[model samples]
Target: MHEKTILVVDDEPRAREGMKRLLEKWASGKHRIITAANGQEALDILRQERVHVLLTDIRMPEITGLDVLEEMREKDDSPAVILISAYPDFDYAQKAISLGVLNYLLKPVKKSELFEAVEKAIHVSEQKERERV
Candidate 1:
């Protein structure tokens, strides 16, 4: 099987590395874990490569996670998305769901929950790949 890429995007140093470490352990050798400090960097990676799963913080400076989703909406093959944030605003939740996000995970995200969300996102990614075939 091909190695899937999972991108973790967050502006905060601690949160970004924390998720990266969690994903590293969970991924073993099956997935490649990548980190973006902000939404702009995340978008850069998205444009340059194929990302299977996108786990991003909903709020950030300049470009928000919602902005990333909007950009991905224009792509023919977009990665599966999971939004994370400290704020659980109803409006954001509604908007994210409308954007076809796989999950909305609240911080501080539990390791078990994050793992589950990633697993589900990869499954969804596989489904998308099949349709593209």
Candidate 2:
């Protein structure tokens, strides 16, 4: 109950594992870092786990990050969404903003930027947990 789950979604094996390892290094004791190859897997995990934050790539085969965000919009208790993109597209950013996404990271993601976003997400998650209790 005390530790939080952070899901890192990316189609590339190196990207997924790299992010998982980075998060583990930063918040291993307080957070459980998980990996998903695509958005579908991410959604499945989100359904089953109490995920606090989602760090996902914007582009993916089948289900994209925007698709995941769209799905979460229907839920009452969705995790804090953080979108990471290799390509900086205005349309994508606009859509993300419309979907209530406040955290956006451009690849290659900087260590400090990712840390700050996760910290903010954890804070949001903590507030949600308090309200739920």
Candidate 3:
């Protein structure tokens, strides 16, 4: 099986690097991790590559992760989007759910929880692809 690709989008370099390190340690060969500084960078990568899952920070400079989701929906892209936020705003979470994002995580996310979420997303994506066949 091809390694599933996960795009991690955040304005903070430390956040992106930490997530990448944790994901590499946990998922290993199961996933190919990619990092983007902001939503625009994430969108650029999405346009050029096949991403199975997107883990993004809610508050970002310029284009927000929510904007990325809107663009993805407009383009009919079906990658699982997981929102990460420090503020834990219910309104943002509700809007994300309305936009088809089922996963919402708080900042300083646990490694175990992140791995589990990514694994579940990958399983769901695989199942959907199989169903399409």
Candidate 4:
């Protein structure tokens, strides 16, 4: 089984919990799922864990989601990032694109979309691992 770690971050407890559960149900391979209530906690996990996928909300109290993405870039192994927001502003989507985010999803993300994104991230990871060989 492919070993992977997925991190879900959101200020809302329900959103955070839901994302975690959804990932657990949809994810394939040997994966570790982690959840954070805010961007700070997410970043802390990023620093300490080798995350394969990251799902984050755009807004948070302490550190913003974009801020977390920026911080992740500094790491040697940046995870595949999926940014979620209630407000589907084009500007934010553009910024996420510039940040190399894999996906920018709207709030109350659909099951199909979530499942597809996670699968794509895993595929990307596999491709990168192959290239690293």
Candidate number with greatest TM-score: 1
Ranking by lDDT: 1, 2, 3, 4
Error of 2 at 97 (Å): 0.7
What C-alpha lDDT, on a 0 to 100 scale, does residue 16 get in candidate 1? 98
Residue ranges of candidate 2 with Cα displaced over 4 Å = none
Q: What TM-score does each of the candidates earn?
A: 0.97, 0.95, 0.94, 0.92
TM-score for predicted model 4 compared with the true structure = 0.92
Compared with the true structure, all predictions reach lDDT values of 0.94, 0.90, 0.86, 0.86
Q: What would the per-residue lDDT of candidate 4 be over residues 34-127, giving only the tens digit for each residue? A: 8999988888888887888888999899688999989878877888898899998898888899999989889789988988888888778777
Query: lDDT per residue, candidate 1, 14-133, as tens digits?
Result: 999999999998999789999999999999999999999999998999999999999999998899999999998899899998999999999999998999999999998888788854
CA lDDT for candidate 3: 0.86
- Which candidate leads the pack in lDDT? 1
Which ranking of candidates, highest TM-score first?
Answer: 1, 2, 3, 4
lDDT of 1 at 71: 99
Model 2 global lDDT (CA atoms, 0 to 1): 0.90
- Separately for all candidates shown, the number of backbone clashes (residues 3 or more apart, or on different chains) is 0, 0, 0, 0
- Write the residue-wise lDDT of candidate 2 on 60-120 in tens digits: 9999999998989888789898999999999999999999885989999999999999999
**Candidate 3: deviation at residue 129, Å?**
0.9
Which has the better TM-score: candidate 1, or candidate 4? 1
- Local error of candidate 4 at residue 106 (angstroms): 0.7
